């Protein structure tokens, strides 16, 4: 996963989860990448799937 | 299985929009971004109860897809959870609406605008969408937006979340009904 084209103003709402470095399961790549942007680059990907 | 219940494809989980039919053939509608690239659909994460196979998909530009049921025994209720749906209608600004989805359950709000353009990026732009102040989160895609016993739309996406509040856009269901020649029941 590459969050360069983010942020994005809207995300589709399918569930294909990713596990962030904050221990939270992000529901899809778009939701994960908007939160990486929101944290000003400090959140990273721990692994794929739920945390 | 009814509107708002979970559906799984080989790549992820969405929600069932509405059960619809043409003649004696039963189908279910959901979001096009869920049908794109999916062939078979199941009722559970274990993939042991088959529901059916994708018969049409339209995403981006619109956001709707239809799955033909191949499972003969599962009950195909014409409801949203237990609410009956008896007709389809066009959304209007100020309309009170409710969405049901497999991750967040049922949430209500109102339609705030019509004919909105939502750019999901990379060329995936959808047009003609219903804007609302109802929240939605991953997993809720394709679930129904209804108002009373009226079917109105299919969940597409948006921003925000149910804890803090959000904005979700929906594909008008009448467009899907007409593209496939099916009806709610």
Swiss-Prot record, chain A:
Glycans are attached at residue 40. Disulfide bonds join 3-33, 11-30, 19-51. Avian ovomucoid consists of three homologous, tandem Kazal family inhibitory domains. This is Ovomucoid. It is found in: Secreted. Residues 1-51 form the Kazal-like domain. The record marks 13-14 as: Reactive bond 3 for chymotrypsin, elastase, proteases A and B, and subtilisin.
UniProtKB/Swiss-Prot annotation, chain B:
It is an enzyme of class 3 (hydrolase). GO terms for biological process: proteolysis. The active site is at 33 (charge relay system), 63 (charge relay system), 141 (charge relay system). It catalyses: Hydrolysis of proteins with trypsin-like specificity. Disulfide bonds join 14-34, 135-162. The keyword Disulfide bond applies. The keyword Magnesium does not apply. This is Streptogrisin-B. GO terms for cellular component: extracellular region. Transmembrane segments: none annotated. Monomer. Its EC number is 3.4.21.81. Keywords: Disulfide bond, Hydrolase, Protease, Serine protease, Signal, Zymogen. GO terms for molecular function: serine-type endopeptidase activity. It comes from Streptomyces griseus. Has a primary specificity for large aliphatic or aromatic amino acids. Belongs to the peptidase S1 family. The gene is sprB.
